[PDB]
Every structure is written in structure tokens, then in C-alpha cells.
Amino acid sequence: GRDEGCKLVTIGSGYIFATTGYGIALQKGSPWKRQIDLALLQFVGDGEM
Amino acid sequence: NGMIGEVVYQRAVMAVGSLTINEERSEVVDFSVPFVETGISVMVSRSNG
Amino acid sequence: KFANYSIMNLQNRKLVQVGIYNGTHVIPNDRKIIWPGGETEKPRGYQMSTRLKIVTIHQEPFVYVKPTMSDGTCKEEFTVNGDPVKKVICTGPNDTSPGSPRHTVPQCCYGFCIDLLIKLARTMNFTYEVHLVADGKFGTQERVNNSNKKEWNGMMGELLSGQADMIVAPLTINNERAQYIEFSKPFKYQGLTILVK
Amino acid sequence: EKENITDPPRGCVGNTNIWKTGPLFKRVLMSSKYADGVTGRVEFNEDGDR
Amino acid sequence: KDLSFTEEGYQVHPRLVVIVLNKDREWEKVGKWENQTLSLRHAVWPRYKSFSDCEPDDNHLSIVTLEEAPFVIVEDIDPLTETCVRNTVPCRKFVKINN
Amino acid sequence: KRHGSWKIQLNATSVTHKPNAIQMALSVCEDLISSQVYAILVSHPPTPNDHFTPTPVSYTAGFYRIPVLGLTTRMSIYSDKSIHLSFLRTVPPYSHQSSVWFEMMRVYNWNHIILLVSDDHEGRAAQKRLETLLEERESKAEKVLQFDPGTKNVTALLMEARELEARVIILSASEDDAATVYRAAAMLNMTGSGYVWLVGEREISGNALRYAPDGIIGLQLINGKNESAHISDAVGVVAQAVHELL
Amino acid sequence: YFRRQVELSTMYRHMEKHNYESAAEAIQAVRDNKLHAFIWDSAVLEFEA
Amino acid sequence: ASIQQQATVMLKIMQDYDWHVFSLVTTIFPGYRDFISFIKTTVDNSFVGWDMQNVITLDTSFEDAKTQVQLKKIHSSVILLYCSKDEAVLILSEARSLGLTGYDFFWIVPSLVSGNTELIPKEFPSGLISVSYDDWDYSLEARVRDGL
Amino acid sequence: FGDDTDQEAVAQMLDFISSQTFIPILGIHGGASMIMADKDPTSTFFQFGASIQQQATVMLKIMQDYDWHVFSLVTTIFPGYRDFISFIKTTVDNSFVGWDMQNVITLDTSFEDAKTQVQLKKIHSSVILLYCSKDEAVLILSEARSLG
Ligand SMILES: *[C@@H]1O[C@H](CO)[C@@H](O)[C@H](O)[C@H]1NC(C)=O
Ligand SMILES: *[C@@H]1O[C@H](CO)[C@@H](O)[C@H](O)[C@H]1NC(C)=O
Ligand SMILES: *[C@@H]1O[C@H](CO)[C@@H](O)[C@H](O)[C@H]1NC(C)=O
Ligand SMILES: *[C@@H]1O[C@H](CO)[C@@H](O)[C@H](O)[C@H]1NC(C)=O
Ligand SMILES: *[C@@H]1O[C@H](CO)[C@@H](O)[C@H](O)[C@H]1NC(C)=O
Ligand SMILES: *[C@@H]1O[C@H](CO)[C@@H](O)[C@H](O)[C@H]1NC(C)=O
Ligand SMILES: *[C@@H]1O[C@H](CO)[C@@H](O)[C@H](O)[C@H]1NC(C)=O
Ligand SMILES: *[C@@H]1O[C@H](CO)[C@@H](O)[C@H](O)[C@H]1NC(C)=O
Ligand SMILES: *[C@@H]1O[C@H](CO)[C@@H](O)[C@H](O)[C@H]1NC(C)=O
Ligand SMILES: *[C@@H]1O[C@H](CO)[C@@H](O)[C@H](O)[C@H]1NC(C)=O
Ligand SMILES: *[C@@H]1O[C@H](CO)[C@@H](O)[C@H](O)[C@H]1NC(C)=O
Ligand SMILES: *[C@@H]1O[C@H](CO)[C@@H](O)[C@H](O)[C@H]1NC(C)=O
Ligand SMILES: *[C@@H]1O[C@H](CO)[C@@H](O)[C@H](O)[C@H]1NC(C)=O
Asked: Do C185 and B31 count as a contact with CB atoms less than 8 A apart?
């Protein structure tokens, strides 16, 4: 999406690949974890993401 | 090393940036919920043809 | 405020004082915490969930539901790759309650999430029981006839009532469901789209 | 009519501590509302004028 | 010492002193001023967790990240006013002298 | 003695038992209105009437909003500030025992709990206090139960509790209901090993003490039946409050 | 109008290099391929097209 | 120093620390209209895009009824107080009483608010940011020698 | 029995009569018909009126017909209040309207006009809901006329 030359249309859409997500690493037992999860689901749950 | 070494040795609270999800990180720290669908892919030469 | 209480034990029809309690602090004495079973130690009475109750909805790419062959049996059929279809004896209703009056039978369930559950049973040593949901809904925060209170129905309603143990379904992970129960990490990354002709 | 009646002391002999109810007495002068007077209805505004 | 005067009777180049309070009830001399620009000794600002007796501060979250182009765009500070533009956030980067 | 040289004096008024509670409240209000009293102390635990109703005295004093400092009862109908308006006391109710039970959760690191209450009046307040305690840890109980006392076929609910995966049994009931569920527990394997029995003080009196399983853990008040020193502390509280009001 | 905007400061940091005096400067600069883009009112550029 | 140069230095500190959400609280203590006007122009001069909460103005000695409402309107990070020294003690004691002395709640005052470094009163948070020029390093004997 | 005064506890006394005489007693007017908190199945006393939840439903139906969505709730500890506040909170939780409910102003005792004035000056909504006794409401309305 920023390529100069535009010779790059990638292999599929992630079919045969790792297929993971991105997350936030916290300490094992942090009290912030549930609140951060609810905040991320609020940020996806309104189209702001 | 890196952000994992900063969080496990507790010189930081959390890591916000792009971070993959595998077994050893879930052993040493705790991920949040995933917010973006980001797997892996392969960029090749992919000429005109 | 700050009520001193006494912690008593009944040692064979005899009241025995085995502790005290301050306004905020428990003080055990030098007596024996005698239990009705074995040792004086605490019984960790949290069983490891040997038998599990699995509920799902009729999801055509995930849960194929098919009536049995003769009586409660499942035919070992093959795929295009020669894979034997690892089925399970699920128990579910026939149709909706206006549709079917009362017909809840064990039938054969297979497909995607059944194979996922069999992989999970290969991972950890446990047993399970696959069953179905009474209605045909996922579950929403829906009103009830009294109390001015919305409760849960569907698979969430059957799980929060204690009738189930683990929902294996395409769990639409949103903010509302996460406020009440804990989740797993998503096996499937899947969005929304529009079906047209 | 109010409380904390304090007086400005003999500040010309060894006293530099200010009179603490200065702004209090000034606020008393601010709320000076009157309807009598040969010059007329006298009352102080927020700037302390006629 | 350029002790020149303005039209209102003020020093053209005075000595601006920036102090704070420690827990030892002392005014610590922190920052002085040059002829034009501000001199700050502590680039990392000390948080001073105990302003008073009872202050449990559990809301200062130490956060580290990694430089990647579609997510973490890191640039230098502005050369004109030495200011991050307001749609960005500040950070510090530890750079050693040599090997 | 030590409350200054204030010019107030004191006088006593005390009324005894009558079987008819109507004439009890009649003699009470005759002694309250004609004396212009300030503080009222109800001090009858061992009444042969099993209703245990100091209600009309507090309702007569609440007609002009006079605080009665009771000394005997521990019910949620008296703990409420809605119906009983200003009926204060220096005795704790049973619901705060759940807080102690939450401290028991902080003793043995026990999380998954099961609640069984025969009553509904105190049971809702006990459920609210216990859910407040669980919200302080941000967790939930596995199963809570409220029902109607009197019957004997609550054994099926105990067998459903057997089908659960926690063994923490928290009970709140009167004497006869506790004896009934202890008989059901003895007839359904529930007095063996692993079971967690943690009750209050109503379960260790009468036949509830008789049919209790050997090894049960319970709570007890301190200076709960010592009533004279309770009167003395109440009079000290009342006298210092009256001097502070004057 | 771009200075009131809350997120287009990158365009402000880019256009500060080539702030031109007259519009004919920009017309001659894109005419001699010195520029690559230019923001202007519509009908003026419609006439100059 | 002038009040204008000192306000410029304090806004330079805020520029170096990027505490963009702030307020401005003044009494009728003198040198205040030019101070508030210089702050308003400097915010209007800035392309930084500062977040300025509205100016709280204190009239007289507090009844802690209207001034409590004026102090409970404050929800920003940096509080700029411009008053006398005793009024600074009173306002900080009220903010400590009202809980307005938190970790978020910063306090940057000039020299005329703070006063002499030889005496430090109570009701001060450990971290009270101030700008003065009563240096114990650059001695008073050096000051009078430079004046001579 | 129909009472002329403003004392609902009279009916509570009648409730005690319903605990003793076992007579079906109908509260007709005034405090005999003023709604108490929670009756008893052993009591055969009955009033003429509606519950506080039904009248709350009527008032929220008025607010629904008028679209006065930004509202508040000023409550003392006058009884029947926990169920009323709980009913309002559940109605906000059961709202397709999207009711802008300002947080509940609470009154512990009679007003000191020091902290209660702060809770009254936090009101920035349109509909101010009051639930207390008679003379307490007269004092609160006189304070609101005093506070504008
Ligand atoms: C309750 O018990 C201990 C020992 O009696 C006492 O020192 C303290 O006041 C209480 N607990 C605490 C807070 O340590
Ligand atoms: C279950 O539903 C189907 C719907 O066609 C019906 O044909 C079948 O008879 C039902 N099963 C029984 C035996 O009730
Ligand atoms: C089966 O589960 C038991 C616990 O009930 C465990 O001890 C055993 O190791 C498991 N066996 C295997 C091979 O999974
Ligand atoms: C009560 O609940 C049922 C559930 O199906 C619903 O159909 C009905 O509309 C509700 N209302 C009544 C009549 O109480
Ligand atoms: C005088 O003012 C102070 C506050 O400056 C106040 O605390 C006190 O109540 C007032 N007067 C007295 C001594 O009551
Ligand atoms: C207003 O003008 C009139 C006429 O001069 C005179 O009474 C006086 O100067 C002023 N004051 C008032 C309010 O009467
Ligand atoms: C301070 O003065 C010196 C000359 O004495 C000059 O070189 C320097 O640039 C001045 N400081 C600044 C950075 O303004
Ligand atoms: C010393 O600094 C220079 C850049 O100023 C560069 O060669 C390198 O960063 C350092 N030397 C080495 C070899 O690390
Ligand atoms: C310095 O040089 C060595 C050469 O091997 C290299 O391994 C190391 O990473 C460099 N970094 C340090 C220690 O500054
Ligand atoms: C105290 O009260 C009684 C009535 O209860 C009455 O005789 C008189 O008011 C006082 N008498 C005594 C005993 O002081
Ligand atoms: C109560 O009811 C059940 C119903 O099956 C019956 O078996 C028994 O009489 C009671 N409970 C027990 C002991 O199973
Ligand atoms: C449990 O109770 C049954 C009777 O219902 C009895 O036969 C059995 O032996 C008991 N089992 C245990 C664990 O003692
Ligand atoms: C109650 O407590 C007091 C405390 O001193 C004690 O003297 C008394 O003996 C106890 N019991 C009685 C008989 O009142």
C-alpha cells in the first residue's frame, strides 16, 4: 500500500500461514488485564478500530 | 532480550507495539485479547508475466 | 464495628474453640483443626472436571447434525482423503418447541469443532459429553417477564445456569459477553460480509 | 456583625506581619449596598466604584 | 555578566532558577537558564511519587516498544521549537557514546 | 460523674414481660409518651414466644422518629433502615459473618463457594453481601440456592450440589432447617471427607447441635449472652451521645 | 484551513519547504516539472487546464 | 526577571515536558491581568496546540462555598497559581483538603507566589514546581557587589 | 381507615394490628394509603394505591413522551429508596432510548449546606428527581431557589 513501482501483489491473503494476532503483554497476574481486554473490545465494538 | 526481557525482569509494565504470539511468550508473560488479524506472508519477485 | 468472633469446632458432640477473629485478622490458636474426614489439613475440594458438558448450536460448516442409522449408532464414513469421520454421539432436540413438541434424542454430530474437541481430548486427559442447545440462538441479554432484569438465553443461558460446562461454538467475541465470562484465544479470525444473489 | 474580629496592630513598632482579615474587611466594603444619600443611591460595583 | 536593564527596570539576562521540593523538605536547585535557551539537568523527569504522606501511585505505567514502520513511526524532535507535534507522543532513546 | 457540671439529671423507666403483645405495646407507649423519653433499650432474649417481635416499641418510637437502641435481635428485618426507621443497635447481624467467611477464603485460599440459604428475607441481604465480597475479588460462586423451608425433599438440590465441582458448603438457616439438611447430609454421604462445613450460631443450638456432623466449623459471638456489660456499654454510648447532643 | 485541522500537520511540515509567493510561480513550477502536486481553488485551475 | 520572561520560561518547561492539558488559577493579587493576557496570547501564538482550561478567578477570602466549586471545576494536569505566599498556603491547604493535590495535579508557581527560599512553610507537596532566583549559590554578597 | 396526616408509619402500626388481630384492614386516605416498604404474608393489611415501581414507570413514561433524556436523581435515605434507585438503574440498563442519567445525588442526613450544596451544584441536567419526605422536600426546594 505504499509501494513505488506497484509490482507487488502478495501471495494470497494469508491462507497457508501462521494466522495469529497482535496483543499486549502483561505481567503474570496483572490487575490491568481484564480492563485492557474490555477496552479493546470496546474499541472494536464501535468501529473506532 | 528486548521487550520480553524488559517485561519479565519488570523494568516496564506492558508492550504496546506489534508483537507476535507464540508458546514461549505465553510461558513467560500473559497476552491480552488480539485486536487485529495479522498472520505472516511471503513477498516474492512476482514480475509481470 | 470490629466484632471479635470465636471459631468453634465440634469434636464428637463437644464444642472446641479452634480460633478467634479480630476486627480484620484471623488468629488460629494452638488447637487442632479437626475435619470430619481424614487429616487436619485443609481439603482442596476443587475437582479437576473429569466429566464435561459440551453444548453447541447447529452450525453447518462446524457441527453437522445427522440422525442415527439404526439405534444410537454412527456410521464410520470416509472423506475424500480417506479420513474416517471422527463423529460423536451428541444429544439434542429435533426442532423448535412450536415445531417439535418433545423430541430430544441422541444423534450423530461431526465436522470442524468436533474434530477440534477431539484434538483437545488428545491434548489433555479428560472426558466430556456433547449435547445441544434447547433453542436455536447464540444467546443475548434479553428481558424476562419480571424483576426488571435482562438475563441470558441460548448457549450462554444454558452455560450460566450450570447446565453446561464449555461452549464450543463460533463465539462472537464482543464487549458484552466478556464482562461476565472468561474467554479463550480465537482459533478463527473471521469478519462480517453480505450475502447477495 | 461577623466573627474573627481582628485589628491592624501598631505596625510601626516591630511588626511586619500583615493583617489577615484585610481581604475580609475589603469584601465587607465590596458588599456595601445603600439606598440613602444626598449624592444618591451609593453602592460599590465589582471594581469598587459608584 | 550582562546585567543590562529594560525600560521597566528588569534584567535583560537574569538567572532563572527552577526548583522543586523533595521528601526531605528541601528546595533542590534543578534547572538554570542560558542566554536564550533553557538548561534542564534531568531529561528524565522524576515522578515524585510521594508528594504527601498517603499517596499510593499505581497509575504510572512504564511502557517500551519497538520501531516498526506501519505501527511505531519514530522521528526526531522539531528543529524549530523543540516540540513534538500534538498528535504524537514523547519518548526517549538511549544512545551510547561509542563501543 | 465525668461529663461536666451540666445541670441535667436522669431517671429510669423499665417494663417487664406480658404475654399479650398488644398490652405490651400499650404499657410501652403509656410509659414513653407520658415521660418524654429519649433512648429506648430492648433487652429480652429468652422469650417463650417464638415470634421474637420487639417491633411495636420501635414502631411507636418511629412515629415521632425516636431511635431505639435494641440489644437482642439479629434479623435483617430489624437490620433494615426502611421499615424499622431508626432502630439502631450494638449487636451484629449474621450477614457480616459472611465477611468473616470471606476472611476464611483468605485463610485457606478457597475461591469456588456454594451458598445454601433456607430463608429469603435475610437470604437476599446475605447474597448481596456475599456478592459484594466476591466482587471485591471479581469472581462468582458456583451455585446459590434460596428456597422455602419446611419440606424434606431438598435432598435433590443437595445431590445437584454433589454433581458440582466445588465442595465449599456455606449454609444459612434456622435450627429446624439446619437439622433437616444435616439429616439429609447424613443420609446422602455428605458428612465424609472433602466437605467444607462453615455455618454461624443458629446451627449449633438445640437439635441443630445434636444432628451436627462431628468436625463442623462454626462461629460464635463474644459477650453475646453476657447482657449486663452489654447494658453498661449501651448506657455509656447513650449517655455520651446525650451529653454531646446537649 | 489546514492549520485548524487536527491531524494534517504532516502536510504542514511538507508544504513549508515550497511556500510560493504567487500562483503563477506554482503554475510555472508544475509546468517545468519542478512540483508534483499543488492545492488550489477549483475553477481557477479549470480555466488554466 | 520580568513576569513575561518568567512565564515564557515556565511555558518552555511545559514545552519540554509536553504537559499540554493545563489550567490557570489567579486571585486579585497584582500583576495578574498582564499575566493572564500574556498566557492567552502565547497559547494563541503557539502551533503546539495547548489544551487550556478556562481561567479561574478568586475574588476575596474564601467561604469555601463558591471557591470550592471553582476548585472542583479543575480537572487538568498542570495548575498555574498566581497569588501571594499566604494565599498560596491557603489554596494548597484547601486543595489538600479537597483532594486536589494528586499525582496528576501538577503545580507550577512563580517566585512572587513562592517567595523567599530562607523560609519554607507547610502544606507543600514534595515535588512543588517553582521558578525563582533567590539562589544560595550565587551569594547575596556577590549580588550587592555587582550592584555596587 | 383513612388518615388525614402525612405519617405512613400509622399503617405500619396498623400492620402490627394485622399481626395481632388478624383483621383485613384497608388503608383508604393519607398515611393509611401511603406506601410502605415491604409487607408480610402473615399480615392481612392492604392499602389502596400503586407501588413505587409503577409510579416510576408512569414518570418515565412521561419522560419518554417528552424526550427529556438528560435527567438526575436526588435521593435522601427516606425509605423505599433502594428499590427506587435500583429500578431506575435497571430501566437505564433496559433502555432503547439511551437515557442520559446523571449520577445519583445522595443525602445522608439533613443538609449541612457545606457538602450537600456541592452535590446540589453538580446538577447540570434537565429533570431533577426528588424522593424524600414533605418538610425535607420543602427545605430542598427552598435551597434550590436559594441556589438558583
Ligand atoms: C487484630 O489482631 C491483632 C492481634 O490481637 C492486633 O494486633 C491487630 O489490632 C489486629 N490485626 C492487625 C491489623 O494486625
Ligand atoms: C423430527 O423432525 C422431522 C421434521 O421433518 C420429522 O420428520 C420427524 O418425524 C421428527 N422426529 C420425530 C420422530 O418426532
Ligand atoms: C490420564 O489422567 C490421569 C488423571 O486422572 C493422569 O494421571 C494420567 O497421566 C493421564 N494419562 C494420560 C496418558 O493422559
Ligand atoms: C413473558 O415471556 C414470554 C417468553 O416467551 C414472552 O413471549 C412474553 O411476551 C412475556 N410477556 C408476558 C405476557 O408476560
Ligand atoms: C476564623 O477563620 C478561620 C479560618 O481562617 C475559621 O477556621 C474560624 O472558624 C473563624 N473563627 C473562629 C475562631 O471560629
Ligand atoms: C440621580 O439624579 C438625581 C438628580 O440629580 C439626584 O437624585 C441624584 O443626583 C442621583 N441619585 C439618585 C438615585 O437620586
Ligand atoms: C551566551 O553568550 C555567549 C557569548 O558570551 C554566546 O556565545 C552564546 O551564544 C550565548 N548563549 C546563547 C546560547 O544564547
Ligand atoms: C564512535 O562514534 C562514531 C559516531 O560519532 C561511530 O564511529 C561509532 O558510533 C562509535 N565508534 C564505534 C566503532 O563504535
Ligand atoms: C561492540 O563490539 C562487539 C564486537 O564483537 C560486538 O559484539 C558488540 O555487540 C558491540 N556492542 C557493545 C558491547 O557496545
Ligand atoms: C421517674 O419516673 C417515674 C415514672 O416512670 C416517676 O415516678 C417520676 O417521674 C420519677 N421518679 C423517680 C423514681 O425519680
Ligand atoms: C424427595 O423426593 C425424591 C423424588 O424422587 C424421593 O426420591 C425422596 O422421597 C426424597 N429424596 C430422596 C431421599 O431421594
Ligand atoms: C454412601 O451412602 C450409601 C447409602 O446411600 C452407602 O451405601 C455408601 O456405602 C456410602 N458411601 C460412602 C462413601 O461411605
Ligand atoms: C460480663 O463481663 C464482665 C466484664 O468485666 C464480667 O465482669 C462479668 O462477670 C461478665 N458476666 C456477667 C455475670 O455479667
From this structure: yes
